[PDB]
Amino acid sequence: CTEQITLYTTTFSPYGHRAHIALEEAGAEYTLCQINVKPEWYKRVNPLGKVPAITFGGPQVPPDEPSPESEKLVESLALLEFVADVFPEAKLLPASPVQRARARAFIAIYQNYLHDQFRDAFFRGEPVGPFLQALETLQSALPPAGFAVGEWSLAEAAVAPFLARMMLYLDAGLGKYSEADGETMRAALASERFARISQYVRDIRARASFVKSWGGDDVQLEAAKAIPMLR
Amino acid sequence: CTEQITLYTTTFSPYGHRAHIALEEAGAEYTLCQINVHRDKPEWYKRVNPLGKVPAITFGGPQVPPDEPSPESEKLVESLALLEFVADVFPEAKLLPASPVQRARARAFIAIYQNYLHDQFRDAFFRGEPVGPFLQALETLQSALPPAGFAVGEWSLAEAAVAPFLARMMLYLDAGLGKYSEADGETMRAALASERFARISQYVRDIRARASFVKSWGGDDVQLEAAKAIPMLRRPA
Numbered sequence A: 001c002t003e004q005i006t007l008y009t010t011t012f013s014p015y016g017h018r019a020h021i022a023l024e025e026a027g028a029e030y031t032l033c034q035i036n037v038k039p040e041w042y043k044r045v046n047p048l049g050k051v052p053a054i055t056f057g058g059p060q061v062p063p064d065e066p067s068p069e070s071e072k073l074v075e076s077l078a079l080l081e082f083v084a085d086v087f088p089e090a091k092l093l094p095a096s097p098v099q100r101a102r103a104r105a106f107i108a109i110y111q112n113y114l115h116d117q118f119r120d121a122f123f124r125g126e127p128v129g130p131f132l133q134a135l136e137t138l139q140s141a142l143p144p145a146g147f148a149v150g151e152w153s154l155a156e157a158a159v160a161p162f163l164a165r166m167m168l169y170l171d172a173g174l175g176k177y178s179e180a181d182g183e184t185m186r187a188a189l190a191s192e193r194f195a196r197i198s199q200y201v202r203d204i205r206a207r208a209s210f211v212k213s214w215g216g217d218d219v220q221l222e223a224a225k226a227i228p229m230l231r
Numbered sequence B: 001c002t003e004q005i006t007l008y009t010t011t012f013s014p015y016g017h018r019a020h021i022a023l024e025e026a027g028a029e030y031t032l033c034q035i036n037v038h039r040d041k042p043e044w045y046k047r048v049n050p051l052g053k054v055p056a057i058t059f060g061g062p063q064v065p066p067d068e069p070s071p072e073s074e075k076l077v078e079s080l081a082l083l084e085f086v087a088d089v090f091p092e093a094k095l096l097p098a099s100p101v102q103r104a105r106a107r108a109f110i111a112i113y114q115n116y117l118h119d120q121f122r123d124a125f126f127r128g129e130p131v132g133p134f135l136q137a138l139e140t141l142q143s144a145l146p147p148a149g150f151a152v153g154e155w156s157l158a159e160a161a162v163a164p165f166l167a168r169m170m171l172y173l174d175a176g177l178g179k180y181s182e183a184d185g186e187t188m189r190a191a192l193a194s195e196r197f198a199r200i201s202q203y204v205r206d207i208r209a210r211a212s213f214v215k216s217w218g219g220d221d222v223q224l225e226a227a228k229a230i231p232m233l234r235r236p237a
């Protein structure tokens, strides 16, 4: 693929991180534009200020000067599938329809059962119980080794940014949860109940594409400590 | 394709309806197995999905009645993944358009439905919450439509995903089913008849004209009878 590709994300967004992983896995040639957690020009990417976004094709332009020709795309999971469609050679999904369906179902488990709990527990200080159960549900869909469908796929691009932050926040004591709920979760994730999901995060954090788009625990940790809803 | 395909769904499920549309659009040789919603699910269904999850598809393995699932068949769940599955199995049906950009926009259209309207359909019709958000989300989905035709012009998985739900909410609305107040009832009907919602009104009847939808929908009256048996849809006395 030779069309130009620009990924727009706010500096520490897990949604942009999704697309960043996928572009790295794809070996894509792309421009990354990070906006500070908003400039007047961004209305030319998306009039509603929606982030992340990808511009595709049109002339090569600096990201703060998006062309009228380029196609503008939003919605992080669609962006994942889009990178895969543009770079089929990279096999960002497995080859078999059955395995691509399992990968997609894994992402559904995250979106439909865990995502909202993670937010309730870490950002709203709601009871932590449902979060742990949903984390276990996701964990139960993992095979005993490798990634969600064996090899790395869009499933990892989708969930890695969130699981990695959940752990980091948890290790750092960040989140609106009670001191007691904080302890319940910390012991939850260090217990054997969650050995699998913790190794999964480890294997994720070792992945080059993740390493490059994470920027390091220290940077994420400093961004982390500036989020009002983590207190 | 030459592997057997069997779709399992509870009768009248919009989620199974999704995959039903897709298999019709694909021209697939498939078997349909409807499970009664208000009966507690045959023991043999554990062999399709042990947690009783529906809808589900079995793929390949030996040709077999649906209540005799083979362990050699691959078993898939989650309705949006099932839509993408059907499309992957039958690339020649072009359930999704050919270019990555248009495919992305089809998936984004689905996300707008799931992110905004889906929960407001539940909240306004099944939980009785104020309906303003439902209308605003309806408008949000409407605004993603092009001037005419379907989400990305030609029919695509976008319609397979949203049609089962848009048809039922308008079905319910016309007929007065839902936990919503009667004031909010008249507000919704008046809004949907109004010019503000002409476009989504046009979209739903274009949806309803589609062969694959007609066949998998089985007529308003039976869907209406189905809906009148959903207790969560009823207002208390």
Ligand SMILES: [Mg+2]
Pocket: B123, B129
């Ligand atoms: Mg609500």
